[PDB]
Design a protein around this ligand. Structure first.
Ligand code: HEC
Ligand code: HEC
Ligand code: HEC
Length: 71
């Protein structure tokens, strides 16, 4: 649905694929080739302009460790 768990060898990341909708009604923001899986995505990405990127972008959202990686 919206709740998506991103397996990580450094602590899984709980991503709410919902609140990120009303906050970013634009799905073309992340989904470039349309809704679906994202090819290439990864660490550098998540930390880059994948997750934090946006976060640190607006200074909103978890940008510190532990806030994403929960053991
Ligand atoms: C970035 C903040 C996103 C926005 C905006 C939207 N979605 Fe999304 N979606 C995102 C991720 C990170 C993922 C998983 C892939 C990954 O790289 O981790 C997804 C996945 C989907 C899927 C596939 C899951 C499934 O149902 O099988 C769909 C169908 C999907 N997303 C649809 C969708 C729609 C309709 C959105 C706007 C209403 C939308 N997404 C916004 C990240 C982001
Ligand atoms: C902008 C394009 C974003 C991208 C890309 C991602 N996130 Fe995000 N996130 C964003 C905002 C603006 C906020 C604050 C809430 C709001 O009003 O939109 C957040 C918040 C989170 C949170 C915590 C919010 C909560 O649950 O209360 C988490 C855990 C989070 N974001 C995770 C996350 C992940 C894992 C992403 C990559 C898959 C990701 N976000 C991308 C804006 C954006
Ligand atoms: C959410 C906004 C995150 C924050 C904050 C940080 N990281 Fe992260 N990291 C995130 C994701 C979504 C992923 C990949 C999970 C997936 O499968 O989608 C990662 C990955 C890592 C890794 C590599 C794990 C692996 O599987 O190889 C490392 C070593 C890592 N992250 C470290 C790390 C550090 C040091 C952080 C603070 C500076 C940090 N993460 C925050 C999402 C998020």
């Amino acid at each position: 649905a919206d709740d998506i768990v991103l397996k990580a060898k450094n602590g899984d990341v709980k991503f709410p694929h919902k609140a990120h909708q009303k906050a970013v009604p634009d799905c073309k923001k992340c989904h470039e080739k349309g809704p679906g899986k994202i090819e290439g995505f990864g660490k550098e990405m998540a930390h880059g302009k994948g997750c934090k990127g946006c976060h640190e972008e607006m200074k909103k959202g978890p940008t510190k460790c532990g806030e994403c990686h929960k053991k």
